[PDB]
Amino acid sequence: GLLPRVNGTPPPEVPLADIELGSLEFWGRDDDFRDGAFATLRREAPISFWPPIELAGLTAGKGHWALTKHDDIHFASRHPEIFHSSPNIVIHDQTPELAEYFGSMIVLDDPRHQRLRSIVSRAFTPKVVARIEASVRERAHRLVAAMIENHPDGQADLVSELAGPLPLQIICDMMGIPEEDHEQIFHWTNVILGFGDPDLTTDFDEFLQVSMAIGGYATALADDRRVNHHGDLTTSLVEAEVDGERLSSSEIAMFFILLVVAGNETTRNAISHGMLALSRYPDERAKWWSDFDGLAATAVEEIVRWASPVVYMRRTLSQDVDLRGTKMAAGDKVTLWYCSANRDEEKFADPWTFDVTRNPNPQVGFGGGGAHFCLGANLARREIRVVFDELRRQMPDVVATEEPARLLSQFIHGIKRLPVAWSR
Numbered sequence: 001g002l003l004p005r006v007n008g009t010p011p012p013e014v015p016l017a018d019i020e021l022g023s024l025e026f027w028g029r030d031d032d033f034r035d036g037a038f039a040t041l042r043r044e045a046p047i048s049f050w051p052p053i054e055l056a057g058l059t060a061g062k063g064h065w066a067l068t069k070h071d072d073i074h075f076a077s078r079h080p081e082i083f084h085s086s087p088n089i090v091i092h093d094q095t096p097e098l099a100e101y102f103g104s105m106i107v108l109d110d111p112r113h114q115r116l117r118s119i120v121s122r123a124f125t126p127k128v129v130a131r132i133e134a135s136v137r138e139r140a141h142r143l144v145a146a147m148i149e150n151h152p153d154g155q156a157d158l159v160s161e162l163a164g165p166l167p168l169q170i171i172c173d174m175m176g177i178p179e180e181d182h183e184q185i186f187h188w189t190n191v192i193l194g195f196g197d198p199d200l201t202t203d204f205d206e207f208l209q210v211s212m213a214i215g216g217y218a219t220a221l222a223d224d225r226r227v228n229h230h231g232d233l234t235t236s237l238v239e240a241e242v243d244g245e246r247l248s249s250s251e252i253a254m255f256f257i258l259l260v261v262a263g264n265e266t267t268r269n270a271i272s273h274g275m276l277a278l279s280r281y282p283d284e285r286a287k288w289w290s291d292f293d294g295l296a297a298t299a300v301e302e303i304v305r306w307a308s309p310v311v312y313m314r315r316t317l318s319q320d321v322d323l324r325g326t327k328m329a330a331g332d333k334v335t336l337w338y339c340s341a342n343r344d345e346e347k348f349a350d351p352w353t354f355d356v357t358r359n360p361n362p363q364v365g366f367g368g369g370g371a372h373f374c375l376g377a378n379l380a381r382r383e384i385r386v387v388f389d390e391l392r393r394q395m396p397d398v399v400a401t402e403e404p405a406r407l408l409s410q411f412i413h414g415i416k417r418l419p420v421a422w423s424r
C-alpha cells in the first residue's frame with residue numbers, strides 16, 4: 001500500500017535495448033519496469049528470442065521465443081499438437097528424470113494427457129466437490145479469525161497467516177489428510193517450493209529426500225483408501241475408471257505433488273496481489289464491499305488478470321511455425337507470457353486500470369484455453385472470493401501497510417511477505 005499510486009497509471013516507456021529477459025537482474029526489478037518492458041515488446045518486438053537465465057556454475061539449456069500478444073498465446077494454447085507440453089512447461093527443467101514425477105498431467109501431451117485428465121476429472125464427484133466447498137469456507141473463516149486472536153496489535157503478515165496456509169489446507173482437506181499430518185506436508189511442500197528461490201540456500205539432496213518422502217506419503221495414503229473407503233478425493237481417485245483404466249498409487253502421488261505446487265502457490269499469490277491491489281486502489285475495495293456477492297465474479301476475474309500468478313508457461317515446437325512473419329523452428333522452446341497478454345492493449349480497454357466491475361474480461365491467467373486449461377480454475381475463483389468475503393466480514397478495514405517483499409522468480413509472480421493492519 002505504502003507508495004501512493006493512481007489507478008490507471010501506465011508503466012514507464014522501457015527502451016527495447018534495455019530489456020534483458022535472460023538476466024536475473026531483470027526479474028528483480030519492480031513490476032512497473034517489468035510491465036513496461038512487456039509493453040515495449042508487444043509494440044516493437046512481439047515475438048523475440050531470448051537466452052535462459054543462467055545461474056553461474058549450472059547448465060542453463062537453450063533459449064526460447066517469447067510470445068507476448070494475447071492472440072499469439074491463445075493460438076499456441078489451441079494447438080497442442082504443434083506446441084507440446086512434453087518434456088516440461090518451464091524454460092529449463094533442472095530434474096528432467098523427474099519431469100513426470102513432479103508434473104503429472106501438465107507435462108503430458110495427448111493421448112496420455114487426455115487419458116489421465118479424464119480419469120482424474122471423474123474423481124471430482126458431486127459429493128467430493130461439496131466437501132471441498134465447505135472446506136474453503138471453513139478454512140478461510142478459521143484462518144482470518146486466528147489472525148485476530150494471534151495479533152492483539154492488529155498487525156500481521158498476510159502471507160504467513162492467511163494467503164500461504166489456506167490453499168494448502170484446502171488441498172489437505174480434499175485428500176483426507178489428518179490434522180496431525182499437516183506440519184509434515186507443509187514442511188515438505190515448503191522445501192519443494194523453496195528449491196527455486198535464490199535468496200534461499202536449499203540443498204539438492206534435501207530437495208530429493210523431501211520429494212520422495214511426500215510421494216511415499218501419498219502412495220501410502222492412496223493404498224489406505226483401497227482398503228478403507230472414505231468420502232475424500234483420495235478414495236475417489238483410487239476408485240475412478242475410464243475405459244477400464246484406473247490410477248495406480250504412484251500416479252495419484254504424482255498428481256498430489258502437482259497439486260501442492262500448481263494448486264497452491266498460484267492461489268496464494270492471487271490472494272496477496274488481490275489484497276495489494278485493493279489496498280492501492282481503495283475505491284475498488286469500497287465498491288466491492290458495498291455489493292460483495294453481486295460484484296464477486298467480475299472482482300475475482302480482475303484479481304486474476306491483475307495478479308497473473310503464473311507469469312509464463314513453456315512449450316516445445318514439434319514442427320516449424322511462422323506467425324507474425326517470425327519463423328520459429330521445430331524443436332525450439334516457446335514461452336507464453338500471460339503477464340503480458342493480460343495487459344494487451346488490443347484485447348482490454350484501459351488495461352492499466354484495476355476495475356472490479358471489468359466486463360468483458362478475456363484474461364488468460366489460467367492459461368490461453370484448450371487442452372491444459374487450469375483444472376482448478378473454478379476452485380481458485382472460489383478460494384479468492386471466499387477469503388475476501390471473510391476479510392470483509394471480520395476485518396473490513398484490513399489494508400496492506402508496506403510494499404511487498406517480492407519473490408525473485410521468472411515463473412511465479414510471488415509475494416514472500418505482505419504486512420497488513422486492521423482495526424476492530
Ligand code: HEM
Binds near residue numbers: 262270374375
Ligand atoms: C489463481 C490460481 C491459479 C492459477 C493462476 C492457475 C494457473 C494455471 C495455468 C496457467 C495452468 C496451465 C494452463 C495451460 O497450459 O493452458 C494450470 C494448470 C493446472 N492447474 Fe491451475 N492455477 C491456479 C489454481 C489451481 C488450483 C486451486 C488447482 C487445484 C487445486 C489447480 C490445478 C491445476 C492442474 C491439475 C493443472 C494441469 C491441467 C493440465 O495440464 O491439463 N490450479 N493452472
